[PDB]
Design an enzyme around this catalytic site. Structure first.
Site, PDB file in Angstrom:
ATOM      1  N   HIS A 356       2.302  -6.330  -4.440  1.00 54.31           N
ATOM      2  CA  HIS A 356       2.750  -5.145  -3.705  1.00 54.31           C
ATOM      3  C   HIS A 356       1.969  -5.087  -2.397  1.00 54.31           C
ATOM      4  CE1 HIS A 356       2.799  -0.783  -2.722  1.00 54.31           C
ATOM      5  NE2 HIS A 356       4.017  -0.807  -3.233  1.00 54.31           N
ATOM      6  N   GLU A 409      -0.161  -4.131  -7.853  1.00 53.12           N
ATOM      7  CA  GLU A 409      -1.033  -3.713  -6.771  1.00 53.12           C
ATOM      8  C   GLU A 409      -2.099  -4.767  -6.488  1.00 53.12           C
ATOM      9  OE1 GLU A 409      -1.115  -2.060  -4.303  1.00 53.12           O
ATOM     10  OE2 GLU A 409      -2.407  -0.301  -4.325  1.00 53.12           O
TER      11      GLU A 409
END
Ligand code: CA
Ligand code: MG
Ligand code: NA
Length: 432
Positions: A356, A409
């Protein structure tokens, strides 16, 4: 696993996070100059630093903590970095953020703690080189205190003094001078930085600043050996509470370990051992079926790599050394691919393809990059070498989807303990 390669690529991850005017020897071909207008409210140069995660905000609190943790690892595991051919590159890596902290410290009692509005920044998907939105800058000051941010930055600067004093004394001495000044500011202007810089509260909300005051004092005591700082560390530190984790918000086991090892303070050792045993098998942290110590859904790899780092520092100073090394190795090796696939982008077997992360999600210039690149179902066009992703769920499951802003993430703090832990494991290969 090839730890040399892991360390090389982890440092490349930080280089791909750089904001500002990039050097001639930039090693990340898809990155260029960006955010050259970042500045204080009186035009103070605020270019540089790291983008925090897959966004383009410069969040001072995790940026400083990642730097303190990286510097600590360079201090303790220098031999592993050197054996890997990565020591000079690691120094160059944190010189980038240390220089940023010097710029941000615009006067004795004013320190810029954020550049970029996270709400505006996260509404954009595209290259940092293509940004055109306003990037406000916010500082802490006597009217807007941030003891946590100021003392964490003082810790990073004091750790940086120790890292650099034997190769660049002029730089190191500047870091230490600003460490002292920022720590005095933190002590004498008390409050939570994410209340004073309210844009930060949705992203890096600090729960308490006393642990940062103890941590900054512990680092300044290591740097200066002045009794007043050891006194400050006892004043704000605890000998009775055990840390839940080591991370950008909670410094407790960090300063307990630092004071035990560097400062020889025996009062804190029982809490270090409590922390270690809590994370070891049979402790209080649940392990996934395939062996990841899994604290919570948000960045489990980060929490486990941070505990591995603490365990490997402990082992170096003969604190539960055999159990610490075996626990630490088990966690890092899970992240390198023990469960069947690597969690380090660009490394090992079947690494994550959709971190991400905006800049690596964009195709090569001059192709367009916008929210189409967020949504597209294939791999990020650029390989974000070295990034440790958030990690699997508690049943070891990982979908590798860019839209999974939890598991996919990447972030500065995710790699900070991880990188030092890998260097520690490389150093153990030298010992054995
Ligand atoms: Ca804290
Ligand atoms: Mg490319
Ligand atoms: Na340039």
């Amino acid at each position: 696993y090839n730890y040399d390669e892991v360390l090389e690529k982890s440092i490349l991850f930080y280089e791909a996070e750089r904001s500002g005017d990039l050097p001639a020897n930039n090693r990340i071909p898809y990155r260029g100059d960006s955010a050259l207008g970042d500045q204080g409210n009186q035009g103070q140069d605020l270019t540089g630093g790291w983008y925090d995660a897959g966004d383009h905000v410069k969040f001072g609190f995790p940026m400083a903590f990642a730097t303190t943790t990286l510097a600590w690892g360079i201090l303790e595991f220098r031999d592993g970095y050197e054996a890997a051919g990565q020591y000079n590159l690691a120094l160059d890596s944190i010189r980038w953020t240390l220089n940023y902290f010097l710029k941000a410290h615009v006067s004795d009692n004013e320190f810029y703690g954020q550049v970029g509005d996270a709400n505006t920044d996260h509404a954009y998907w595209g290259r940092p080189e293509d940004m055109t939105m306003e990037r406000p800058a916010w500082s802490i000051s006597p009217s807007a205190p941030g003891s946590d941010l100021a003392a964490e930055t003082a810790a990073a600067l004091a750790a940086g003094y120790l890292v650099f004093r034997d190769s660049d004394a002029a730089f190191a001495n500047n870091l230490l001078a600003h460490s002292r000044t920022l720590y005095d500011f933190a002590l004498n202007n008390r409050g939570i930085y994410s209340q004073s810089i309210s844009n930060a509260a949705g992203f890096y909300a600090s729960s308490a600043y006393e642990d940062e005051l103890a941590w900054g004092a512990a680092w300044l005591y290591r740097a200066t050996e002045e009794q007043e700082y050891l006194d400050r560390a006892y004043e704000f530190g605890t000998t009775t509470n055990t840390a839940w984790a080591y991370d950008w918000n909670e410094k407790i086991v960090g300063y307990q370990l630092l004071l035990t090892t560097s400062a020889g303070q025996t009062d804190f050792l029982p809490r270090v051992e409590n922390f270690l045993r809590n994370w070891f098998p049979g402790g209080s942290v649940q392990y996934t079926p395939l062996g990841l110590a899994w604290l919570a859904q948000w960045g489990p790899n980060r929490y486990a790599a941070n505990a591995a780092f603490i365990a490997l520092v402990s082992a170096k100073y003969n604190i539960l050394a055999s159990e610490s090394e075996q626990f630490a190795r088990s966690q890092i090796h899970y992240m390198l691919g023990d469960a069947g696939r690597s969690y380090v982008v660009g490394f090992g077997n079947d690494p994550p393809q959709q971190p991400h992360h905006r800049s690596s999600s964009c195709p090569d210039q001059p192709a367009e990059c916008d929210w189409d690149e967020f949504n597209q179902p294939g791999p990020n066009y650029q390989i974000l070498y070295g990034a440790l992703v958030g990690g699997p769920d508690q049943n070891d499951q990982f979908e590798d989807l860019r839209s999974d802003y939890i598991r996919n993430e990447v972030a500065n703090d995710y790699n900070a303990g991880f990188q030092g832990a890998v260097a520690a494991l490389r150093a153990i290969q030298l010992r054995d």
